[PDB]
Ligand binder design. Structure first.
Ligand code: CLA
Ligand code: CLA
Ligand code: CLA
Ligand code: CLA
Ligand code: CLA
Ligand code: CLA
Ligand code: CLA
Ligand code: CLA
Ligand SMILES: CCCCCCCCCCCCCCCC(=O)OC[C@H](COP(=O)(O)OC[C@@H](O)CO)OC(=O)CCCCCCCCCCCCCCC
Ligand SMILES: CC1=C(/C=C/C(C)=C\C=C\C(C)=C\C=C\C=C(C)/C=C/C=C(C)/C=C/C2=C(C)CCCC2(C)C)C(C)(C)CCC1
Ligand code: SF4
Ligand code: SF4
Lengths: 142, 742, 158, 42, 81, 30, 146
């Protein structure tokens, strides 16, 4: 897979006063997220957790608590200003993980190379009754 | 600058559309594939902002809708005046209003309801009323059925005229944007034009018609030979006989020696023992001074000339250190989004309705009003209910604005931005205050009740036990009772009589007002009110502040204003839309209003209302057990709720029997609401499915595919039925009790 | 006399109820002019409830131990002017309505989108279908005879 | 014109007039037969 | 693995779920069982929050993607604290 | 007599020790 | 995050840093006993004056013994929370970074054994504070109102 990650660097942050939507104990103990994109021009955009702020020129760096907010902001940036982006996960050990594209091409369209994790080749009605599988680990949809 | 620009004939008055429902919504106009179509049709009729994208057309539409509303109001007034003219005993009531029950509605003798036309005195039979029109019609010196008749006619004329004006302004001459969006001249006029000149012309109608005829009636005369109004202005000699100063034309006014008119324009204050009402001289001075004040206020803003301010030139100057840039640009927000204006105006109107409800009872303006108990009570509680509803609507539409038309890119602001930037702190602290008030205002009642049922009365919360004193209220009352001494020499007594100083006003063996003392029970009830209000504010403010996006759902706004949930994911996401926040807050507002009105009823019937003996001993309607039985919930059951519910429950086989019947249906619906509030949908969907099968078996399956109501509509119908049940119950209770005993 | 219920053509508590009712009505009547239209309507209702008591004392109404009518729906046509005849009359009316509605729907089923005619009725077809009520017993009868009233295994779709 | 006819054939107004007529019939029957408890015809 | 996603061969490869997946769970892969020659796949069920909006879109006969619930975790619960 | 010994015990101290024991239990982590 | 004058100011940070719950330059047991005697002097007042025997000449001892009992209950709760959340050889979870950024030694107060010393100190201090409030309220008791 010639789809390498980008190893999220430490680049400046958007101009924002700092507010009660930031991180909490969770981010400092378990995990948090960082979304990163390059911007075309200093404009205004509403952060997910409150108010609005301005971005800068070049690459950006925003931190957030949960992946859902990051991806919501990313879809907003892709449907409002037509720019690409990534977001990374961080662990308190110091690890950094690359999550969303996994190839660079959106998961919206086809790109061979992805495996087939979690298919069942039978219509929904073919599932069986729990009695046939009771007292076991298996379930009907498996 | 500003001009009269309009447009000509956008839409033609053609019935082409009336036969095609849902012409406005593209999807609705296609056809009802199922039954939810006919719910969705009504559900979004008035939703103007979801029918276009430009403010011009929706502004025209709301301009026409206002005319529709005004036409309905005029028709209602006309119906009222008519039923007063052709179907009342109003003349007999004017003969002597001390012990003659105002009745203005008779019922047809068809199905045994003749008993409804009970005994009201004065040789009349009819359903007794409590609207309180009669005090007004005696204030304005109507005193003749011809006047009611012609007034009803004129009201009908104005109604048809307004309906016309509506049709014409939407269809033929539609206003343009630069007219609507021009708020400077609108403020200028409405300040100077509508309110000021209104109060001025009313002061006219009072000093030239009401005042003399009312003074004559107080002297005591059959209104038959009372001189007609116009015969009091044409021939001056009558008013001359009344008021010497009034026979001096216009010299004492223009020549600045106004003190001559001191007789009919004065500043007495207090009430008038002849009728308990207000000294009409005072109310005339009031209306006139208010007219002058509004006129001088109206001249603020520059409209076309070179003088005057600009509503953009006022905000941007204010910019403090903490907040920063101040109100810059807010002028654009409140001029480019109707929902914002609707919310602001609904909030202010609800607050004004509440304060009107309050100021009514404590300062009875009309004559012979503070002695028709039911009228006073019913007016107060009605105004309270209207205010509550208006406030909730304000919050809801504020949330709608927050969702749809808010955007920082062009409708920017630096104040609301800060507000939203720390919403969590606001909601957290308000929540903690709500918990604190709940505890220290209800747990007190619980403790008192328990320590009562445990035979430890001397460990109770009352005057006879561990004592809590509302010291600030008594302080203010003392100040208001000693203020006419030095601070306000131009007055004669306290501003009202409810202040803790003076004597009592009683007419026809009944009392109207007297001093009002505050006991620990008043402290507790006031804190209950404060707590419930704080909780309602918490609900609604949380809804508004979190309508955009919460820390639970990141992009709530994109999902729209009114949607049921976001699926059972992430542990369940039921009732997250601001719409559901309003659905919740409605019940709490209902509870606040209910407890407030119960407190009012008990306090009045236990410390003010009642009868006065020949010697002067007072025996109140309920015996004055408030300060000793309002401090236990079990008391509320026993002393007030159970006891004073007698007259509604024995009411069968009497004139008041109607008030009895509702007392059950009110409860019934009240029940019924639960069926919608508790259940869900999928169950009903499967049941409807089986019923559709049972029908289809007989070749009866209708093409309008049956569908159990959508979730949001289920919650809506539930809350509507619940509010209806509660309000109808308290309504029947109040009317039956007060009109039977009082 | 079913379980001892005498008809109030002969019982007494009925007479007591009647007497007390007309008495309270008359006592209410003497608070106006003897000619005032309200007093006139009061006397009218007095004689009206009186003749009601009379009518009840004409049709075999077995009458309670407390002075109240009490229906006898046990099947004996002796007391049938309460259930049997009004029952079959209402059954006729209900069958009328059910059959006319069913026939209208079955007819209008054959169109492009029958919903448009289910919300906005074909008032012409409605008028020329509606008066068929006089056929509802017999017509449906033949239907069941010819099995054209029910279906066997067509459940969804149509 | 025909538009107002099709509009008049919309279920709300038709239902209102039908129910008004039915209620009028019932109240007139009650007027001409007060309290009408039994079936004193057969 | 907290929740669970399943996909069935009635998938018409219309690709509404992925466009509506809030937390980047699903995707498409080349198949041979429809015109679009593409079927769903769920290799990222960890971040599966659990909202049914995905299968609230699939316009098939009854469904073609099911969201079976299971135990809970810190990320399957939208926790942010 | 005996009630004065027992009722306070089954009201405060025995419920207290039960609650703290179950607290300790449910908070276990092996 | 937002930094208002409340959460960020010289005097407020100074005060909060001076009270025993954050002065890491003292043994945790001593901070515990200090907060204990603080709350002990604290709680005696209303409990005694408004108790269910206030109209009795025993109300003093009554309120004081009640305060002591509440202190004992809360010390039990402290020890229970500590044994629940703190393991016996695992590291600390105290803030080890100050405002400037000086990497702070892990606060021994936030350790199992440290929390135990804290609990014992708090209990002893609460008892002492309660008995001290008693002896100062019912022997040398002129300049007060009660
Ligand atoms: C105060 C009462 C009131 C007023 C003034 C209006 C005003 C209006 N309604 Mg309306 N409406 C109301 C109550 C009201 N509504 C209620 C309670 C319902 C039931 C939920 C509806 C359901 C409704 C529908 C379904 C529609 C309207 C529409 C309209 C608009 C055109 C109607 C018209 O010209 O008829 C003129 C009628 C006469 C001159 C006389 C007829 C008798 C207008 C803004 C229409 C609209 O806005 O479409 C874009 C439309 O299609 N209304
Ligand atoms: C708010 C409007 C309103 C309402 C609710 C009613 C309600 C009623 N009217 Mg009414 N009416 C109204 C306005 C209204 N009217 C107006 C504006 C007029 C003047 C055109 C009339 C003229 C009128 C007459 C002439 C009669 C009624 C009657 C009735 C009753 C049947 C019913 C209580 C009837 C009634 O109560 O008879 C005793 C009756 O005969 N109305
Ligand atoms: C003069 C004030 C005013 C005005 C102009 C409006 C106007 C509007 N409101 Mg609104 N509202 C008001 C007062 C007002 N309301 C108050 C006081 C409350 C609090 C109770 C609300 C609560 C409220 C909610 C919760 C919602 C609206 C909605 C709407 C919009 C659609 C109307 C609709 O669907 O009803 C059509 C008419 C009916 C449904 C008839 C109902 C009749 C009642 C329920 C029967 C019982 C009456 C006895 C419309 C712009 C809705 C909206 O914007 O949808 C997107 C919406 O969701 N409002
Ligand atoms: C099994 C229950 C039952 C059923 C189906 C009927 C049905 C009927 N009864 Mg009947 N009836 C019932 C119980 C029932 N009744 C009871 C409990 C009593 C009182 C003991 C009577 C006393 C009764 C009388 C006295 C007469 C009927 C008659 C009739 C028929 C008219 C009708 C078919 C009448 C009949 O036979 O036809 C005229 C008739 O005269 N019924
Ligand atoms: C003429 C039409 C028609 C006919 C023949 C039937 C027939 C039947 N219905 Mg029914 N139903 C109808 C309309 C009709 N329904 C409508 C419009 C509704 C919605 C309000 C229902 C709701 C309904 C329920 C909820 C249930 C039935 C049930 C039944 C069955 C037992 C009878 C019963 O309990 O009804 C009781 C009587 C009613 C529910 C009253 C509805 C009748 C309406 C008012 C008549 C409509 C006439 C039409 C709309 C007006 C136009 C006139 C014409 C000019 C076109 C029976 C097969 C029951 C069943 O499943 O049995 C197994 C049952 O549980 N129906
Ligand atoms: C069976 C349980 C039980 C027992 C034996 C006691 C025992 C006692 N209580 Mg007590 N109490 C209890 C449950 C109990 N309480 C509960 C559940 C509550 C909360 C409702 C209280 C609230 C309470 C108060 C508020 C007071 C007592 C007081 C007293 C005294 C005595 C030591 C009094 C006391 O000693 O003062 C602290 C006193 O004033 N109790
Ligand atoms: C709203 C909060 C509140 C407050 C400030 C007080 C205040 C007080 N309570 Mg109390 N109490 C409350 C709620 C409250 N109570 C409730 C809700 C209950 C029932 C569970 C009790 C049950 C209760 C008992 C049983 C006793 C008190 C006692 C006392 C006094 C010590 C003090 C005046 C004690 C007392 O009377 O001493 C004077 C006492 O013995 N309370
Ligand atoms: C209901 C609340 C309440 C009540 C009734 C009391 C009652 C009392 N307090 Mg007190 N106190 C309270 C809350 C309360 N406290 C709180 C919340 C604080 C803050 C920690 C204090 C801090 C405090 C101090 C510092 C002192 C008292 C003291 C006293 C006693 C004498 C007060 C005097 O004359 O001065 C009295 C028993 C004085 C005393 O000698 O206590 C015995 C004393 O020195 N109180
Ligand atoms: C008193 O407020 C007065 C204070 C003065 O602020 P400014 O002078 O910066 O605000 C100028 C005003 O015109 C508002 O724009 O208001 C604030 O600082 C906002 C925060 C209020 C904090 C209230 C806490 C409760
Ligand atoms: C005859 C008939 C029947 C039956 C019926 C019934 C049974 C009914 C019931 C009913 C119930 C069981 C209940 C009810 C109730 C009602 C109500 C409850 C109403 C109300 C209304 C209104 C309108 C109100 C109003 C108001 C108030 C009072 C408050 C607020 C203000 C106002 C003014 C809004 C049958 C089926 C056989 C057949 C058909 C016909
Ligand atoms: S749950 Fe359904 S919607 Fe939520 S992510 Fe997993 S798939 Fe997309
Ligand atoms: S389920 Fe519906 S959406 Fe998801 S893949 Fe199959 S078809 Fe496309």
């Amino acid at each position: 897979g010639f789809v390498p990650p980008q190893l999220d660097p430490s680049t400046p942050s958007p101009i924002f006063g700092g507010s009660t939507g930031g991180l909490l104990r969770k981010a400092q103990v378990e995990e948090f997220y960082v979304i990163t994109w390059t911007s075309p021009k200093e404009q205004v955009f509403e952060m997910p957790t409150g108010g609005a702020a301005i971005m800068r020129e070049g690459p950006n760096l925003l931190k957030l608590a949960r992946k859902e907010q990051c991806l919501a902001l990313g879809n907003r940036l892709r449907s409002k200003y037509k720019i690409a982006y990534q977001f990374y996960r961080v662990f308190p050990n110091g690890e950094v993980q690359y999550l969303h594209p996994k190839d660079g091409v959106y998961p919206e369209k086809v790109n061979a190379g992805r495996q087939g994790v979690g298919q069942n080749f039978r219509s929904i009605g073919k599932n069986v009754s729990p009695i046939e599988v009771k007292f076991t680990g298996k379930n009907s949809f498996d | 600058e500003v001009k009269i620009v309009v447009d000509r004939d956008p839409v033609k008055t053609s019935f082409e559309e009336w036969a095609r429902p849902g012409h406005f919504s593209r999807t609705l106009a296609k056809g009802p594939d199922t039954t939810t179509w006919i719910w969705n049709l009504h559900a979004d009729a008035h939703d103007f902002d979801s029918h276009t994208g430009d403010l011009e057309e929706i502004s025209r539409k709301v301009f026409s809708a206002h005319f529709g509303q005004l036409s309905i109001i005029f028709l209602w007034l006309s119906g009222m005046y008519f039923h007063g003219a052709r179907f009342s005993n109003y003349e007999a009531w004017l003969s002597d209003p001390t012990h003659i029950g105002p009745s203005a509605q008779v019922v047809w003798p068809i199905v045994g309801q003749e008993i409804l036309n009970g005994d009201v005195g004065g040789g009349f039979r009819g359903i007794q009323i409590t609207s309180g029109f009669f005090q007004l019609w005696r204030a304005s010196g109507i005193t003749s059925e011809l006047q009611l008749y012609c007034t009803a006619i004129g009201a009908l004329v104005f109604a048809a005229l307004m309906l016309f004006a509506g049709w014409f302004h939407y269809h033929k001459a539609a206003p343009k944007l630069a007219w609507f969006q021009d708020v400077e001249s609108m403020l200028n006029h409405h300040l100077a034009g509508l309110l000021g000149l209104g109060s001025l012309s009313w002061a006219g109608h009072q000093i030239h018609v009401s005042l003399p005829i009312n003074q004559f009636l107080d002297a005591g005369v059959d209104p038959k030979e009372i001189p007609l109004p116009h015969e009091f202005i044409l021939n001056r000699d009558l008013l001359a006989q009344l008021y010497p100063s009034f026979a001096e034309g216009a010299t004492p006014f223009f020549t600045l020696n106004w003190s001559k008119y001191a007789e009919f324009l004065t500043f007495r204050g207090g009430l008038d023992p002849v009728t308990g009402g207000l000294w009409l001289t005072d109310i005339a001075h009031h209306h006139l001074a208010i007219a002058i004040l509004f006129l001088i206020a109206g001249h603020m803003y520059r409209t076309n000339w070179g003088i005057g301010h600009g509503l953009k030139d006022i905000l941007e100057a204010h910019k403090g250190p903490f907040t920063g840039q101040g109100h810059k640009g807010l002028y654009e927000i409140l001029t480019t989004s109707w929902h914002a204006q609707l919310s602001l105006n609904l909030a202010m109107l609800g607050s004004t309705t509440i304060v009107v409800a309050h100021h009514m009872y404590s300062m009875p303006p009309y004559p012979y009003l503070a002695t028709d108990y039911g009228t006073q009570l019913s007016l107060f509680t009605h105004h309270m209910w209207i205010g509550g509803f208006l406030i909730v609507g304000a919050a809801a539409h504020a949330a709608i604005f927050m969702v749809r038309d808010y955007d920082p890119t062009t409708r920017y602001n630096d104040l609301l931005d800060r507000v939203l930037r720390h919403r969590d702190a606001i909601i957290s602290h308000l929540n903690w205050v709500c918990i604190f008030l709940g505890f220290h205002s209800f747990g007190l009642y619980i403790h008192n009740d328990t320590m009562s049922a445990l035979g430890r009365p001397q460990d109770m919360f009352s005057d006879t036990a561990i004592q809590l004193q509302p010291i600030f209220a008594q302080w203010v009352q003392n100040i208001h009772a000693t203020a006419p001494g030095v601070t306000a020499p131009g007055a004669t007594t306290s501003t009202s009589l409810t202040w803790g100083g003076g004597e009592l006003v009683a007419v026809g063996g009944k009392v109207a007002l007297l001093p009002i003392p505050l006991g620990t029970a008043d402290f507790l009830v006031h804190h209950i009110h404060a707590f419930t209000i704080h909780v309602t504010v918490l609900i609604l403010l949380k809804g508004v502040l979190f309508a955009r996006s919460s820390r639970l759902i990141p992009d709530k706004a994109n999902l729209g204003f009114r949607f049921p949930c976001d699926g059972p994911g992430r542990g369940g996401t039921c009732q997250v839309s601001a719409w559901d926040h309003v659905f919740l807050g409605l019940f709490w507002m209902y509870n606040a209003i209910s407890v407030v009105i119960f407190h009012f009823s008990w306090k009045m019937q236990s410390d003010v209302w009642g009868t006065i003996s020949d010697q002067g001993v007072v025996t109140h309607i309920t015996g004055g057990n408030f300060a000793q039985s309002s401090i236990t919930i079990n008391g509320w059951l026993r002393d007030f709720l159970w006891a004073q519910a007698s007259q509604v429950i024995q009411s069968y086989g009497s004139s008041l029997s109607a008030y009895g019947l509702f007392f059950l249906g009110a409860h019934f619906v009240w029940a019924f609401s639960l069926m919608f509030l508790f259940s869900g949908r999928g169950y009903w969907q499967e049941l409807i499915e089986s019923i559709v099968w049972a029908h289809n078996k007989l070749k009866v399956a209708p093409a309008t595919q049956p569908r159990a109501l959508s979730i949001i509509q289920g919650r809506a119908v539930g809350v509507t039925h619940y509010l209806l049940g509660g309000i109808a119950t308290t309504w029947a209770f109040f009317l039956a009790r007060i009109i039977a005993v009082g | 006399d079913i379980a001892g219920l005498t008809p109030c053509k002969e019982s007494k508590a009925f007479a007591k109820r009647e007497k007390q009712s007309v008495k309270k009505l008359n006592s209410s009547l003497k608070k106006y002019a003897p000619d005032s239209a309200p007093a006139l309507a009061i006397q009218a209702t007095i004689d009206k409830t009186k003749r009601r008591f009379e009518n009840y004392g004409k049709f075999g109404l077995l009458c309670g131990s407390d002075g109240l009518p009490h229906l006898i729906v046990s099947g004996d046509q002796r007391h049938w002017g309460e259930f049997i005849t009004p029952g079959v009359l209402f059954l006729y009316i209900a069958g009328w309505i059910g059959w006319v509605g069913r026939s209208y729907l079955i007819a209008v089923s054959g169109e492009k989108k029958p919903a448009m005619r289910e919300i906005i009725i074909d008032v012409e077809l409605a008028a020329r279908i509606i008066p068929r009520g006089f056929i509802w017993p017999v017509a449906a009868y033949r239907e069941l005879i010819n099995g054209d009233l029910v279906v066997d295994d067509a459940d969804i779709g149509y | 014109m025909r538009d107002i006819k099709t509009y008049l054939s919309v279920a709300p107004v038709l239902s209102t007039l039908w129910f008004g007529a039915l209620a009028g019939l019932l109240i007139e029957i009650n007027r001409l037969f007060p309290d009408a408890l039994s079936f004193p015809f057969f | 693995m907290s929740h669970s996603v399943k996909i069935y061969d009635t998938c018409i490869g219309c690709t509404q779920c992925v466009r509506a997946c809030p937390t980047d769970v699903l995707e498409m892969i080349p198949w041979d069982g429809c015109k679009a020659k593409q079927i769903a796949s769920a290799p990222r069920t960890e971040d599966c929050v659990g909202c049914k909006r995905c299968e609230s879109a699939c316009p098939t006969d009854f469904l073609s993607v099911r969201v079976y619930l299971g135990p809970e975790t810190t990320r399957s619960m939208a926790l942010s604290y | 007599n005996l009630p004065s010994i027992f009722v306070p015990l089954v009201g405060l101290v025995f419920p207290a020790i039960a609650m703290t024991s179950l607290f300790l239990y449910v908070q276990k982590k092996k | 995050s937002l930094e208002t004058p409340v959460t960020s100011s010289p005097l407020v940070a100074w005060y909060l840093s001076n009270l025993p719950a954050y002065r890491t330059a003292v043994s945790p047991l001593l901070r515990g006993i200090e907060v204990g005697l603080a709350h002990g002097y604290l709680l005696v007042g209303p409990f005694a004056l408004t108790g269910p025997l206030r109209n009795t000449p025993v109300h003093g001892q009554a309120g004081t013994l009640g305060a002591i009992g509440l202190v004992s209950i809360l010390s039990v709760c402290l020890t229970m929370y500590g044994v629940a959340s703190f393991n016996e050889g695992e590291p600390s979870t105290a803030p080890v970074l100050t405002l400037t950024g000086r990497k702070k030694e892990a606060d021994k107060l936030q350790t199992a054994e440290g929390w135990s010393q804290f609990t014992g100190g708090f209990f002893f201090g609460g008892v002492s504070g309660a008995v001290w409030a008693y002896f100062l309220l019912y022997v040398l008791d002129l300049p007060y109102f009660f």
